[PDB]
Amino acid sequence: VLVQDLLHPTAASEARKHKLKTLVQGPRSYFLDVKCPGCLNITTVFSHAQTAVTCESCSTILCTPTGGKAKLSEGTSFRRK
Amino acid sequence: MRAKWRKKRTRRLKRKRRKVRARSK
Amino acid sequence: VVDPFTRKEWFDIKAPSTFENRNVGKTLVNKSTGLKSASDALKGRVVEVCLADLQGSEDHSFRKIKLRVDEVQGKNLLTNFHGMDFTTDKLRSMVRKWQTLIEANVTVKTSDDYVLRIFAIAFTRKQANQVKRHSYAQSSHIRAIRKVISEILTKEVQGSTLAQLTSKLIPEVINKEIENATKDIFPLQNIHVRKVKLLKQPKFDVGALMALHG
Amino acid sequence: PKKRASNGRNKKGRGHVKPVRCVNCSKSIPKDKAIKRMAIRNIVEAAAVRDLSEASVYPEYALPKTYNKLHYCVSCAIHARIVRVRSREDRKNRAPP
Amino acid sequence: AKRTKKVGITGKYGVRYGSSLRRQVKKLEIQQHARYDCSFCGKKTVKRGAAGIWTCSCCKKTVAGGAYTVSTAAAATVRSTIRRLREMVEA
Amino acid sequence: SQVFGVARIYASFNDTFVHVTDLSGKETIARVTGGMKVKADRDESSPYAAMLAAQDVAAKCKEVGITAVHVKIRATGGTRTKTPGPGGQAALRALARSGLRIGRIEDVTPVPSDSTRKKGGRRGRRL
Amino acid sequence: SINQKLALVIKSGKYTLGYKSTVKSLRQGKSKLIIIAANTPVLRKSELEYYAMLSKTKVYYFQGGNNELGTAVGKLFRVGVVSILEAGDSDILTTLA
RNA sequence: GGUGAAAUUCUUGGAUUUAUUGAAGACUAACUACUGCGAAAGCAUUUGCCAAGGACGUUUUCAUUAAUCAAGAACGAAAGUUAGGGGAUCGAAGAUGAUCAGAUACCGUCGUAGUCUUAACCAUAAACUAUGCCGACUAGGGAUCGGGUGGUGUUUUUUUAAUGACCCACUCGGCACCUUACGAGAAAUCAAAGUCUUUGGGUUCUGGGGGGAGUAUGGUCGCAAGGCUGAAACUUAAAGGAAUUG
Ligand SMILES: [Mg+2]
Ligand SMILES: [Mg+2]
Ligand SMILES: [Mg+2]
Ligand SMILES: [Mg+2]
Ligand SMILES: [Mg+2]
Ligand SMILES: [Mg+2]
Ligand SMILES: [Mg+2]
Ligand SMILES: [Mg+2]
Ligand SMILES: [Mg+2]
Ligand SMILES: [Mg+2]
Ligand SMILES: [Mg+2]
Ligand SMILES: [Mg+2]
Ligand SMILES: [Mg+2]
Ligand SMILES: [Mg+2]
Ligand SMILES: [Mg+2]
Ligand SMILES: [Mg+2]
Ligand SMILES: [Mg+2]
Ligand SMILES: [Zn+2]
Ligand SMILES: [Zn+2]
Ligand SMILES: [Zn+2]
Structure with missing residues (x-):
């Protein structure tokens, strides 16, 4: 306070903020390849679905819509990319 | 006198003048 | 110069089966006179007695019970049932600020076609480590509880007569069945069946009534 | 002028x-302005x-208080x-004892 | 082209009888000449003729009703109430 | 261990009521009030009176055949003062100290899920 | 809801409205399900009901007047009976109905 | 019975009290809080239905569509007015018991209208935060309400999870409080009443000494009661605000 680097804010105090009040704004959601080992292939899901994402071939389920982040269902794995 | 009693005082006053004036319509 | 005291006939009150005692007290009538008698006129009255007094133990200090006389056979007047209550003081104590009240009721039948309205009450509880100083639920919480209390209350009634319902309430099974389904929704404390006010019965039936005594 | 922020x-x-x-005195008075007390x-x-x-019978019995919430009308609550x-300051303080 | 500011059908009476009575008539008049929905056939073709008699243009059912309106508030609650009372007797 | 009847004390201001009755309630036994043991209106509810009348009542209670009792103390209530008046206090003591027995006593003051407009108007009884 | 089902039919299937033409459909073993207004008089109801049973065709007693049955099928006149001929994409035929 | 104390009042009609049972209409106690929601008026039993809404979440969609607003309009506590229903309660008027020099009152009694509801009116309240709305900026602190994110947190046991409630950190948007004051103010006080003689973000509305007077007049709305619009002549040196000492 009184003199600080507004141009190079620290990654943490930057990280804790709001998605619009960061330096330059950008999302804080993410995508993921997801597999329920009944099948073999990997469907790409949105961390904040809304739509209860219907799996590829087997209409099994996958995730459920929520407040924000989707709840993935039962026995499933992932990765953020 | 209380404001509202004065407001009533003149409410009546207009009714009489309202009346007396009709006499002449 | 009368004194109706040297004029009234005396009686002693016998309660029904499923409690401790049945002998509860005495009563005054009048002489079984020709034209308006000590029989038909009264007897058919009601009696409130703290069921602790007819269960012994004092884990029953609250909970008031109504006994009504339906039959009489030579000084011995037998009652059945008219309802149940709570002591005013108990209730007034388990209602404290900073917490949520929850009431819910249902009109429902039994096997022996008695109609009754039965009550139930419960209050929020603080978690055993809760920092914030009030604890209320979420209205959505409250709707959910009542609907399930109601689910369980209708279940118990239409169990065999009030007779087993009478046997049902006394060890307060119901109270904890509630709290079981409940626990999945929201803490809660107290939780009683509080009241039940009877309100409609079938037809005398000297049989079943007599089938409470021996 | 004004005399209280509440x-x-x-x-x-x-x-x-x-x-x-x-x-x-049975005066009507808003519930939030009401001066209350658990008796x-x-x-x-x-x-x-x-x-x-x-x-009495029993031993020691129980003994159950009466509970009833009291509402006063200011003039009664003052009287x-x-x-x-x-004082002007002691007014500000909301702690009871 | 609006013909009258407020007397409506009641304009036949001219200045006579005094506003307040004409008011009261205009109401029941409007009630009583109007065309109503038919419970049975669905078309709105019930018109009055002599008090408490309501008949359907096509389909021709006649119902007893109010002197100036098909259904009367009282009649209706009474319908509701008998309904309720009947319910007890087979339930 | 006794013979049980019911007590029931109504003890509002301006007067206090005591009367034992059958445990069922229907058949009464003995009564008398505060307004029965002094003459002065002014002094109709005061402890000293409810005493002398809890005395009278105890007498008849054990002169007919009641050895004990349970009490239900009670105020005016309704859309009124919902608080225990002066003489139920005294009378309770005056009927226990009488040499009668006591067992289980709850307040039965009528307390509504509130309403019917309380009396005395919006500005309240003012003087 | 049922109307919501009816709607799917009315926009993707084939049907016919009115007493006479569903009779043609009923004789012709062509109706897949007739739907009937509340206020439709009992004699008509009874007859359709008979024509129906003779053709092993099922029947829905639409709780509602001809006025509404019409709005149900999205039409600005009133209909006392509808005849489902082909069930567009909707499951009306093989659900609760 | 009622009061400071009384009295009018009620009582062989067994009053007041008690007991079982019923009817009527109103209301929603306790839980109820510096807690919720709504444009404001306002809104607290349950259950079903009907459509509505803010906040939040969002790597969705359109892409300047917006801010504020004379005219005009929706809603608008209480009372009041029209036509039905209702009419338990309380209760303008009236009538009485008392008090008083008087007592048209305060207190006690009787109780009309009213209080509730339907279909229409009325459009006013200290309708208040006495404080326009949209946007920006300026300073600390602990609570709480709703949403969300993070946690090899606690508790629930069953076999660990999954839930749920709880705990801690942060983040949006709420109802408020605390402490300071850079700052503002005639002060009281004020995170706006601040960023104004170093005087300009956008926009709406009202005031210009006190009475006369919200009066007269015209217009207009209303069944009415009344609402909106709304002067002057004349008079007058003060009226008024906040604070201090008495
Ligand atoms: Mg003339
Ligand atoms: Mg001053
Ligand atoms: Mg002052
Ligand atoms: Mg005073
Ligand atoms: Mg309640
Ligand atoms: Mg305007
Ligand atoms: Mg114009
Ligand atoms: Mg009335
Ligand atoms: Mg008078
Ligand atoms: Mg006088
Ligand atoms: Mg007068
Ligand atoms: Mg105004
Ligand atoms: Mg207000
Ligand atoms: Mg205010
Ligand atoms: Mg702050
Ligand atoms: Mg979490
Ligand atoms: Mg001078
Ligand atoms: Zn799969
Ligand atoms: Zn008061
Ligand atoms: Zn017809």
Whole structure:
């Protein structure tokens, strides 16, 4: 306070903020390849679905819509990319 | 006198003048 | 110069089966006179007695019970049932600020076609480590509880007569069945069946009534 | 001028609460402006409790207080009950004892 | 082109009888000449003729009703109430 | 261990009521009030009176055949003062100290899920 | 809801409205399900009901007047009976109905 | 019975009290809080239905569509007015008991209208935060309400999870409080009443000494009661605000 680097804010105090009040704004959601080992292939899901994402071939389920982040269902794995 | 009693005082006053004036319509 | 005291006939009150005692007290009538008698006129009255007094133990200090006389056979007047209550003081104590009240009721039948309205009450509880100083639920919480209390209350009634319902309430099974389904929704404390006010019965039936005594 | 930030008493974000009736003079008075008190007291009293237990059945029994919430009308609340009137500052303080 | 400011059908009476009576008539008049929905056939073709008699243009059912309106508030609650009372007797 | 009847004390201001009755309630036994043991109106509710009348009542209670009792103390209530008046206090002591027995006593003051407009108007009884 | 089902039919299937033409459909073993207004008089109801049973065709007693049955099928006149001929994409035929 | 104390009042009609049972209409106690929601008026039993809404979440969609607003309009506590229903309660008027020099009152009684509801009116309240709305900026602190994110947190046991309630950190948007004051103010006080003689973000509305007077007049709305619009002549040196000492 009184003199600080507004141009190079620290990654943490930057990280804790709001998605619009960061330096330059950008999302804080993410995508993921997801597999329920009944099948073999990997469907790409949105961390904040809304739509209860219907799996590829087997209409099994996958995730459920929520407040924000989707709840993935039962026995499933992932990765953020 | 209380404001509202004065407001009533003149409410009546207009009714009489309202009346007396009709006499002449 | 009368004194109706040297004029009234005396009686002693016998309660029904499923409690401790049945002998509860005495009563005054009048002489079984020709034209308006000590029989038909009264007897058919009601009696409130703290069921602790007819269960012994004092884990029953609250909970008031109504006994009504339906039959009489030579000084011995037998009652059945008219309802149940709570002591005013108990209730007034388990209602404290900073917490949520929850009431819910249902009109429902039994096997022996008695109609009754039965009550139930419960209050929020603080978690055993809760920092914030009030604890209320979420209205959505409250709707959910009542609907399930109601689910369980209708279940118990239409169990065999009030007779087993009478046997049902006394060890307060119901109270904890509630709290079981409940626990999945929201803490809660107290939780009683509080009241039940009877309100409609079938037809005398000297049989079943007599089938409470021996 | 103005004399309290809570104006009369306790209503910020509402417009209308509801009147209660003063327990003493039956004056109507908004529930949030109302001066209240839990009258938790015994049924018996001071020294009557000895006589109570002694000429009773059971042992020691129980003894259950009466509970009833009291609502006062300010003028009543001032005339006897909790009130006094405080300095300009002591007014600001909301802690009870 | 609006013909009258407020007397409506009641304009036949001219200045006579005094506003307030004409008011009261205009109401029941409007009630009583109007065309109503038919419970049975669905078309709105019930018109009055002599008090408490309501008949359907096509389909021709006649119902007893109010002197100036098909259904009367009382009749209706009474319908509701008998309904309720009947319910007890087979339930 | 006794013979049980019911007590029931109504003890509002301006007068206090005591009367034992059958445990069922229907058949009464003995009564008398505060307004029965002094003449002065002014002094109709005061402890000293409810005493002398709890005395009278105890007498008849054990002169007919009641050895004990349970009490239900009670105020005016309704849309009024919902608080225990002066003489139930005294009378309770005056009927226990009488040499009668006591067992289980709850307040039965009528307390509504509130309403019917309380009396005395919006500005309240003012003087 | 049922109307919501009816709607799917009315926009993707084939049907016919009115007493005479569903009779043609009923004789012709062509109706897949007839739907009937509340206020439709009992004699008509009874007859359709008979024509129906003779053709092993099922029947829905639409709780509602011809006025509404019409709005149900999205039509600005009133219909006393509808005849489902082909069930567009909707499950009306093989659900609760 | 009622009061400071009384009295008018009620009582062989067994009053007041008690007991079982019923009817009527109103209300929603306790839980109820510096807690919720709504444009404001306002809104607290349950259950079903009907459509509505803010906040939040969002790597969705359109892409300047917006801010504020004379005219005009929706809603608008209480009372009041029209036509039905209702009419328990409380109760303008009236009548009485008392008090008083008087007592048209305060207190006690009787109780009309009213209080509730339907279909229409009325459009006013200290309708108040006495404080326009949209946007920006300026300073600390602990609570709480709704949403969300993070946690090899606690508790629930069953076999660990999954839930749920709880705990801690942060983040949006709420109802408020605390402490300071850079700052503002005639002060009281004020995170706006601040960023104004170093005087300009956008926009709406009202005031210009006190009475006369919200009066007269015209217009207009209303069944009415009344609402909106709304002067002057004449008079007058003060009226008024906040604070201090008495
Ligand atoms: Mg003339
Ligand atoms: Mg001053
Ligand atoms: Mg002052
Ligand atoms: Mg207001
Ligand atoms: Mg005074
Ligand atoms: Mg309640
Ligand atoms: Mg305007
Ligand atoms: Mg114009
Ligand atoms: Mg009335
Ligand atoms: Mg008078
Ligand atoms: Mg006089
Ligand atoms: Mg007068
Ligand atoms: Mg105004
Ligand atoms: Mg205010
Ligand atoms: Mg701050
Ligand atoms: Mg979490
Ligand atoms: Mg001078
Ligand atoms: Zn799969
Ligand atoms: Zn008061
Ligand atoms: Zn017809």
